[PDB]
Design a protein around this nucleic acid. Sequence first.
RNA 1: GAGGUGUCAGAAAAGUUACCAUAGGGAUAACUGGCUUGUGGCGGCCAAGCGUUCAUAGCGACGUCGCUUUUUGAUCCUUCG
RNA 2: AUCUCUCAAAUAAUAACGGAGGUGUCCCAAGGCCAGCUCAGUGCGGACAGAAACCACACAUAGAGCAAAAGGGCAAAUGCUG
RNA 3: GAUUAGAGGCCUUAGGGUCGAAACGAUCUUAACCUAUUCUCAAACUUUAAAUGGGUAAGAACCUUAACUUUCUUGAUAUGAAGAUCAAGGUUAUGAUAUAAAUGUCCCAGUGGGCCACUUUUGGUAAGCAGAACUGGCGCUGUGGGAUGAACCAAACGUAAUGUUACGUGCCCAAAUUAACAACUCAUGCAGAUACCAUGAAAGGCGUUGGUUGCUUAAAACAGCAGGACGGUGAUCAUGGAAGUCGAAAUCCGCUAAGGAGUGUGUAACAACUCACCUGCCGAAGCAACUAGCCCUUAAAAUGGAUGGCGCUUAAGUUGUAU
RNA 4: GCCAACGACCAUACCACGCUGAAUACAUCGGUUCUCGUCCGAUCACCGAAAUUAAGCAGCGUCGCGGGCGGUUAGUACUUAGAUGGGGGACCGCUUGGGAACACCGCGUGUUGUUGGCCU
Lengths: 290, 217, 75, 182, 113, 158
Amino acid sequence: KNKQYFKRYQVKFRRRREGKTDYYARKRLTFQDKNKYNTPKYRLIVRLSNKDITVQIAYARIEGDRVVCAAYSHELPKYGIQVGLTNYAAAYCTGLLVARRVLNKLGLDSLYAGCTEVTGEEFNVEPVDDGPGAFRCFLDVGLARTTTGARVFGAMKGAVDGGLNIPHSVKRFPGYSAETKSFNADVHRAHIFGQHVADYMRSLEEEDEESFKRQFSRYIKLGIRADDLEDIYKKAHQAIRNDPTHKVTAKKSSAVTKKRWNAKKLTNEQRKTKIAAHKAAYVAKLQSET
Amino acid sequence: GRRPARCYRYCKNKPYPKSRFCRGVPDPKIRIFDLGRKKATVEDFPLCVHLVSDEYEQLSSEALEAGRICCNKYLVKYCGKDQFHIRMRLHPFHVIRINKMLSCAGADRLQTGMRGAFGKPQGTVARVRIGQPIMSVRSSDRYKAQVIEALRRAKFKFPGRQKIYVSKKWGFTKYERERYEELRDDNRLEPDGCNVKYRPEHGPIAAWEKAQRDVYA
Amino acid sequence: AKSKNHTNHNQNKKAHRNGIKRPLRKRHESTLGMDVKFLINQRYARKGNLSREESVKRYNERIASQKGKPKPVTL
Amino acid sequence: MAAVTKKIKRDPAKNPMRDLHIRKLCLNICVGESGDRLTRAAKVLEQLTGQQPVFSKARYTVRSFGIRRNEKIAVHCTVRGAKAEEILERGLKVREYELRRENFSSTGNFGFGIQEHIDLGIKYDPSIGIYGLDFYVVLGRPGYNVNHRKRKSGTVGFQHRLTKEDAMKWFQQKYDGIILNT
Amino acid sequence: EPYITWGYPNLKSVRELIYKRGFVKHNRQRVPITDNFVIERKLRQAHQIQCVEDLVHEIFTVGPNFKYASNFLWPFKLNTPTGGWRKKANHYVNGGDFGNREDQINRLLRKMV
Amino acid sequence: TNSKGYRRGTRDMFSRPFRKHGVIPLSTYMRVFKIGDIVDIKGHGAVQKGLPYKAYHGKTGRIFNVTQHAVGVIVNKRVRGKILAKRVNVRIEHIHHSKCREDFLRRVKENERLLKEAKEKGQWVSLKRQPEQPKKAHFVKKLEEPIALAPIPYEFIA
RNA sequence: GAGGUGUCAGAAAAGUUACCAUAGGGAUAACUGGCUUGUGGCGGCCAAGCGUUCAUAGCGACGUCGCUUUUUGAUCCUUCG
RNA sequence: AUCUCUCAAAUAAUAACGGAGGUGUCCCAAGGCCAGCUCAGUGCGGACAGAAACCACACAUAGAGCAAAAGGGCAAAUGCUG
RNA sequence: GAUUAGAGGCCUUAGGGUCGAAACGAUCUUAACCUAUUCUCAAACUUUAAAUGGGUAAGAACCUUAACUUUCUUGAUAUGAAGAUCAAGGUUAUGAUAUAAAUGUCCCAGUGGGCCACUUUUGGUAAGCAGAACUGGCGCUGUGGGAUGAACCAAACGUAAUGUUACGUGCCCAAAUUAACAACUCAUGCAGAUACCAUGAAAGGCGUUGGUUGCUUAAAACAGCAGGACGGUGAUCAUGGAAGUCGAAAUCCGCUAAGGAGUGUGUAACAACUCACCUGCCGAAGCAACUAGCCCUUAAAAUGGAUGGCGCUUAAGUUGUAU
RNA sequence: GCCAACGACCAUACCACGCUGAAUACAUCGGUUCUCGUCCGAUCACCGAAAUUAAGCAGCGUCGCGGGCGGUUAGUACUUAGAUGGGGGACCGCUUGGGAACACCGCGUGUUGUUGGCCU
């Protein structure tokens, strides 16, 4: 069926086809008050893959969206994190990364030091006086569900503990028991230091050798026992507090026209002659029988 | 109430509908819009001829039926029953605008001096632009003297001045007669009931190729 | 009594006898019906423009007191 | 169409990805009565699969059978993974698994209906009642969740989407169910 | 265009026009010609015209002072062209009178003025 | 017997013309308007909290309101005859820009620059606007194919 | 804010005068004229047929289009001193 | 008095006892707003299984729903459910 | 939405069947269905889409530039936005005008019933009726012109002399029966005559005058007067006759320049019998429908009288036009 | 020449079908102790990788649909303006200037922002 059904059809746009935005959150995310004219709203972007979790800082303009700051879990190999790139422990240091990377951009490395000794502290940073108004930040959850315990809040957690400025509430944290808080504030000390994962190595330390052949694999390949995980984080965090390397790369370059590579599109001379290569075959298949 | 014929010589009331909103519409009895051998192919009737008028003349529904019957009886008495394809090309969707005057018998005794003046339907009529082809015959070439000399007695039921065209098309198709021949000869005109197929090249391949197959084999 | 009514006849012609006349024309138009304040925020700044020769240049040396503004080029 | 295949030796179009796994099994208890007929059916399913049975508030009043809207007319459930493969083979002896031809849909999934639901190794317990059942197991290919994931969610195409033959292959290769074109 | 009959004049019309039935407009009144003075007195400094054949020059040759060079004239008072008007019905190119005539205006102004 | 009132007569106006239904773009939620950026008032069918009513749509105006998510306009409409000003409040996605200023601003900066190049030779400004003129008097060789070239009609009979 | 004004900017409100007495109105009829003609008297046309046969002597169906003002309504243009 | 669709000749405005209608209600959810989740149909289906129920899977540009007339909008909503 | 025609179909929705016990084999057909179309349509349907007319804008109340201002919800340049104040700046920025522009009172006397034509247009069959949108006019307005007539078309009216024009010249009528004609049109009881406007339709004409397209003729056509015109075959269809003939299935030919199972007077048989046809005869145009100017039929009113009267007719007439 | 994230314009970007895809990746795939929802660890959620380039996605092919866009249709249709222009009216012919469209033919099948990273 459905011949003319294509004619009156129209679409939802491009990112709805590939499932990238929603257009319902982002519009009422970036609904800037018009009294302020083009002061940017400066939201924070966190997206995730099966192997990587990402952290971006961007804002809208008229033509589009400039993304001033970026992050990956790919940088964490420089900070002693080899595996486990989709942990809530790993979620902390990623938000911690850009939390001082912007402070190198605007020079606010001294002020807004943030929560230093993290053991699960609900520390909204205070707006300081007599000088720099603090750079506010807003949170997007993208397309994932903002249930109590999503890992996207862990990217917020290192961001809010690094000195960034968010209207931030606490009811959607993992470990805060929804019936009823009772803020067990030390549960993030088990989250950020990976103890919620580190017990699962220890609670499978003696039960199955095949458990290590299963998930939390490659920890055995590097001798990562279930004891020393938090200090890898703590040494990374001060090194995060030392300096983010700001992704300097100077290969420069092996990129251009390699090799062609994507099938340049067969213009009018090679279209109709390909038809002419195909038209003369069909009369030849009839000229064969007579 | 089957008002006399002089009252609708001019399309000056509104282009009316026939709705799914107003119930009460009577019957247009024109249940046939074409006569002759409708089972004929295109090759049976090469000749074509219409009958046309020269105004914005409003045409009543009734002489369409006379236009059916009157040329029918001549053509069944002259040149065989099935040797043509009569077509009256026109549907009377337009309605006329009536208050019925059955205000008699005394027991009712108010309705209308002219308060108010709504309408009721009693019949239909047809709206004709200039050069709008109405009554047409698709036959063979040997009956040009049969149809037009029967078409006299249908022109004197459709009012006013009417001219007579002899087509140069090949029957009721949308193709000229000399144009009809050369593109038919290979594949490009594929035969159907009353018409043909315009350009089977697009597409994309196999419909051209299936038409390529049966003309060779 | 249905005589003839409702009708816009001649009425336009009698309007184009005195010209059609965009309201007046003005320069410093009224300010009412807006955001009510915004408006009085200007009233502070309307008390602020005190210098054309005295304090307009004193801040310029104090611009260089913080060795310029190299940092805040984005915010 | 006009696209060169040329079969670069990374696959013979073999099976690392078309490995044909069961998506789910749907159990349905279509009872024509609520209330006592519902709850007598309800204590069956909690030991067939151990799952919480999901009921069905009915559509509307067709008036033909005295049944209305919102009736909680029937019982159903869904079972997938590590539990469906045993309850099906407990049914194949009841099914006498050389099954008839249709019995089959072209989607690559199929189902059947049974009488005398006691014979899968359960106690009869005459306080519960006898029950005829219908079943529907859903096979699939792992990657089919792209039509049903929350994000980046796309359709299939002709492949890896199944035909009726794929299950009919899988019905006859393993479990040896001959097709019975009857 | 149905109500005006506009045309392109020759030499001898425009010389004869401002001469014969030309008036001039200083201080928004209408005092005709009688010397070279009635242009020179009020066109001398800000504009550059002081003889009647120089007011010719900024109209018949067309220039950048033209827009002030014929609000300076009051409209003339042409008389009525004897022989008549041929019909006065239509535009020129079917019946003949008003409109895009543009070249046979000279046979009019030899009569009409 | 009615206009009177509030949204009657919106057959082809107030909806969305073809193949543009559904979710709004997000370009127009971004735009910025100062005092004096002359703007239009037009119709829309995707922000259903606010409209300009049945008479305005198709008129443009000045802006002398800057607010949360609204625009307050001056606009001229015909009373008989006291053509007044009106102050209409409207959410932003009803509104398109004027481009009628948008030629005129590059009428400015050319004149600031073409006088600036004229500031080295002196003459001449030539800086106002003039449409097309009576052109010239060419002489035209055939050059290309001498005359006749004779299309004379004969077409009626059909 | 509400109790209330639906004849909706807000009187509380049933009849008829062939005994009826007044200001007036053609801004508004019955009567007389007037343009119009669904109505009806009134012809034309083409012939489906009838007329034993024969379409056209006389007829003329189905449909086609036209005048008069006897009525029949229409309308309110004139006369309500 | 009062509401729509036309009547309306593409700004708006507007006629007669012109045409089609509508209203003097109704809802603590049919409101406010976050959350999940997409209907009209139609295909192949499946003990008792048709017009019969219920589950499954595909196609589902909205052909529905949105208290009420008629227009208009409406597709991770302004609908279903919570 | 509503809507006409068939076609294309594996169809299995399948209705009648059919070869078959039914067929489950097979076979059409008819209903469904899809596929390609096709005839037409829309005041309350829209995929595009006009002209006329809506709207703002076409700078010195500017245009760029500084750093100041902000008691602010926004924002660390304590940005941005707007504000005050310096710096640079052509000749001011589309045409054509301004009979002068610009405003506050008396709410100032009136008036709050209208009419018409063109287009656009509802109500009604309709009207010199009603009902309107956009203009112009009539009421308020005379006026020159269709005799006449508030609106038609010229022009919008201080008192005067001259000269000259938008309707019309036979004459009452002021001006041509033009030192301008080409054709037009015959009317036996209103031939026709200057837009609204005060009329005339459906259908013909060996009435005329212009045409287009068909044929055919000089191997002499038409009209016009000469010769033949049946048999093989009463083979045959038809017996109310068929034998050539009410009507014919058929079906050729023989004969021959030309004679056909035949053209014939509501000829029931044979026949009688002339056509067709060919040639004589005469020898330059003829004939078929077709189209459309006027006259022509149409087309009938009551007081006796109307291009406006007298009247006209190779015009004073209907048409294109000279001066 | 690509890949991701964020987009922007939102079909030249779509769909049907076929083909390819180096790297980076995206994915796919795997488990259920905790967060956690669940009838159902499939969708959701937490852990992370064995296996995979089949699909998805990207790139491309189709006298593909669709849509974009050009050229003709066509100065035709309608039309603002004007008349002592005809016609029995209907309706049309001119003067005045704007001036279309579906069909019909052709061309084209995403362009791009910043942010990285890859390098056939």
